[PDB]
Design an enzyme around this catalytic site. Structure first.
Site, PDB file in Angstrom:
ATOM      1  N   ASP A  35       0.831  -1.206   0.000  1.00  0.00           N
ATOM      2  CA  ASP A  35       0.000   0.000   0.000  1.00  0.00           C
ATOM      3  C   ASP A  35       0.866   1.257   0.000  1.00  0.00           C
ATOM      4  O   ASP A  35       1.364   1.668   1.050  1.00  0.00           O
ATOM      5  CB  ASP A  35      -0.910  -0.033   1.230  1.00  0.00           C
ATOM      6  CG  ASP A  35      -1.800   1.184   1.354  1.00  0.00           C
ATOM      7  OD1 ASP A  35      -1.910   1.941   0.377  1.00  0.00           O
ATOM      8  OD2 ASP A  35      -2.399   1.363   2.452  1.00  0.00           O
ATOM      9  N   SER A 199      -0.436  15.550 -12.080  1.00  0.00           N
ATOM     10  CA  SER A 199      -0.708  15.187 -13.455  1.00  0.00           C
ATOM     11  C   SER A 199      -0.941  16.443 -14.283  1.00  0.00           C
ATOM     12  O   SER A 199      -1.472  17.447 -13.792  1.00  0.00           O
ATOM     13  CB  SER A 199      -1.914  14.242 -13.524  1.00  0.00           C
ATOM     14  OG  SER A 199      -2.345  14.028 -14.850  1.00  0.00           O
TER      15      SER A 199
END
Length: 330
Positions: A35, A199
């Site tokens: 994770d 992004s």
């Protein structure tokens, strides 16, 4: 040193991925959820409340000759889905895919929430976010990656998640046969303890690319892709019959639909998530309403590049002094 381990979807929807981890001496092999959005290595154990264990493999520290109680240490964590666990802590030898760390903090669960009990396939979590998020008190502990780092050939790990198929976590090296083209690297902020990056934009299907900054985290421990409501609305508007359902808890779409791809930007590069990756199947068994793999982050407070996004790429988690993230198509 290096390590390499296969990671396997827990079910037919890729809801999560499990990777075998050897703990203790002799080894006890548990299947953990790696994770990158948390920083605790915790396991179901011989100390876990009996009624809260249902089919998981447990770590029994008393059967490990290298286990030592970390005196006075406790831990307690909650995740983005509202699940939680807590307990005490041992140090022990932990190996992943041939890479061994001695003195790793192994957090032993005394309590786990229902969602953990109900999932027989996940024996615990192995956190790979920054150690500043580790919940052990009163002395915060380091992640497996942080403990291994200095020994690794290169201070990196890579996530290569499969679509409805096994994939690979590598530690200490970049497998240049595992991706196509080049890896584009992008800056990381560790201020929140996450692999947080920005992004450069998105496209829906064959549509034009929208240049826009989207801050978010690369999180292998989250199943779906959570993005701003504007972006998500633009995606689902291209799917006939799709709608946001308050009762179901997100966007749903007719199971008869063909989904468009979703592209996200990494610098000047582009990662394309095929439409099929965005299908999470009937909302309940036998339903013709299917759950979408792209959902709004509006209720979370952060955008999350979860497995839906990451499995479309070969992803480098670069833990150099100034960390960065790399993405390649594959």
């Amino acid at each position: 040193s290096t390590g390499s381990a296969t990671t396997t979807p827990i079910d037919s929807l890729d809801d999560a991925y499990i990777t075998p981890v050897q703990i203790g001496t002799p080894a006890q092999t548990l299947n953990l959820d790696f994770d990158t959005g948390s920083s605790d290595l915790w396991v179901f154990s011989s100390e876990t409340t009996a009624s809260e264990v249902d089919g998981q493999t447990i770590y029994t520290p008393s059967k490990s000759t290298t286990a030592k109680l970390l005196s006075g240490a406790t831990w307690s964590i909650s995740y983005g889905d509202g699940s939680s666990s807590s307990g005490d802590v041992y140090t022990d030898t932990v190996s992943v895919g041939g890479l061994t760390v001695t003195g790793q903090a192994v957090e032993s669960a005394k309590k786990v929430s229902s969602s953990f009990t109900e999932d027989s396939t996940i024996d615990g979590l192995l956190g790979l976010a920054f150690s500043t998020l580790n919940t052990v008190s009163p002395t915060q502990q380091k992640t497996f990656f942080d403990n291994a780092k200095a020994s690794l050939d290169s201070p990196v790990f890579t996530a290569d998640l499969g679509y409805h198929a096994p994939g690979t976590y590598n530690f200490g090296f970049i497998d240049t046969t595992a991706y196509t083209g080049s890896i584009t690297y992008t800056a990381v902020s560790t201020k929140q303890g996450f692999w947080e990056w920005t992004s450069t934009g998105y496209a829906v299907g064959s549509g034009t690319f929208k240049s826009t900054s989207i801050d978010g985290i690369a999180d292998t421990g989250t199943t779906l892709l959570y993005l701003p409501a504007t972006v998500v609305s633009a995606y689902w508007a291209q799917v006939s019959g799709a709608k946001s359902s308050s009762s179901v808890g997100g966007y749903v779409f007719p199971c008869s639909a063909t989904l468009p791809s979703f592209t996200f930007g990494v610098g000047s590069a582009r990662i394309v998530i095929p439409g099929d990756y965005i299908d999470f199947g009937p909302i309940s068994t036998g339903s013709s309403s299917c759950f979408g793999g792209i959902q709004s982050s509006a209720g979370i407070g952060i955008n999350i590049f979860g497995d839906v996004a990451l499995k479309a790429a070969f992803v480098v988690f670069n833990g150099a002094t100034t960390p960065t993230l790399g993405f390649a198509s594959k």
